[PDB]
Amino acid sequence: ILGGREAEAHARPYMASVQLNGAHLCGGVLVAEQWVLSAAHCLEDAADGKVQVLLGAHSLSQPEPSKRLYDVLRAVPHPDSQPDTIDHDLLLLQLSEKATLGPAVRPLPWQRVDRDVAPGTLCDVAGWGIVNHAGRRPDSLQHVLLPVLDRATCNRRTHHDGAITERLMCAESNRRDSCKGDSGGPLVCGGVLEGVVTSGSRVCGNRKKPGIYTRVASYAAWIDSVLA
Ligand SMILES: NC(=O)c1cc2cc(OCc3cccc(C(=O)O)c3)ccc2[nH]1
């Protein structure tokens, strides 16, 4: 997260760290007792490498009573995801067992009605992604409040030049933004998950290149299908 602040420890009990070989790789969001939603490009070239999900965390390195590392039974990328596109960039991770729920570990309600979030709505994005251009990685969860940007402005030639489909949404990226390592994490509006940070390479904190998030409401039937 660029231009954000350290999050209040355990105030976002749905926040997951998707890990590869014991290091943070991507964000994720607990959407059911046994399921974490993240981004499909996080899984790219990770074959053989061990994927785990850390729940109940604030610090990535320090012991916390609520922290628990879960192994992954199944990793299910969206079938239409492709390495060279930002489309259908979702991944469902089935934990090895149902997560132990409590005040620091709880699934987040997610949007099932396929209607756009209104432009200007203030949404929250959290993650352990880089915090500066040098690539500094924070030990503790960071977050930033970002206003939703209307799709037509986001699609302008100077911005994302038509790449923003009805299945995607944008948020302002003026000095405050998601970045590398935040991919897969949640965009929460009014206490409901609305988007998942995309995982394609993009500049961070440049107002001319808004943040891109996959609209979960646009994938409600796929999420249901995988869990069933
Ligand atoms: N969600 C975002 O805003 C955002 C994602 C993102 C990803 C970025 O490169 C991640 C990457 C991809 C492939 C290989 C490596 C490697 O390890 O060599 C690293 C850079 C800026 C970024 N911004």
UniProtKB/Swiss-Prot annotation:
Keywords tagged on the record: Complement alternate pathway, Disease variant, Disulfide bond, Hydrolase, Immunity, Innate immunity, Protease, Secreted, Serine protease, Signal, Zymogen
GO MF term list: serine-type endopeptidase activity; serine-type peptidase activity
Catalytic activity, EC: 3.4.21.46
Identification of the protein by name: Complement factor D
Entry's localization field: Secreted
Disease / disorder: Complement factor D deficiency: An immunologic disorder characterized by increased susceptibility to bacterial infections, particularly Neisseria infections, due to a defect in the alternative complement pathway.
GO cellular component: extracellular exosome; extracellular region; extracellular space; ficolin-1-rich granule lumen; platelet alpha granule lumen; secretory granule lumen
Regulation: Circulates in plasma in a mature but self-inhibited form. Activated by factor B (CFB), which displaces the self-inhibition loop. Associates with CFB complexed with complement C3b. Specifically inhibited by anti-factor D Fab fragment (AFD) antibody.
Reactions mediated catalytically: Selective cleavage of Arg-|-Lys bond in complement factor B when in complex with complement subcomponent C3b or with cobra venom factor
Disulfide bond positions: C26-C42, C123-C189, C154-C170, C179-C204
Keyword Cytoplasm applies: no
The family this protein is said to belong to: Belongs to the peptidase S1 family.
Chief subcellular location: secreted
Known function: Serine protease that initiates the alternative pathway of the complement system, a cascade of proteins that leads to phagocytosis and breakdown of pathogens and signaling that strengthens the adaptive immune system. In contrast to other complement pathways (classical, lectin and GZMK) that are directly activated by pathogens or antigen-antibody complexes, the alternative complement pathway is initiated by the spontaneous hydrolysis of complement C3.
Domain Peptidase S1, chain residue ranges per copy: 1-228
Swiss-Prot/TrEMBL domain comment: The self-inhibition loop inihibits the serine protease activity in absence of factor B (CFB) substrate.
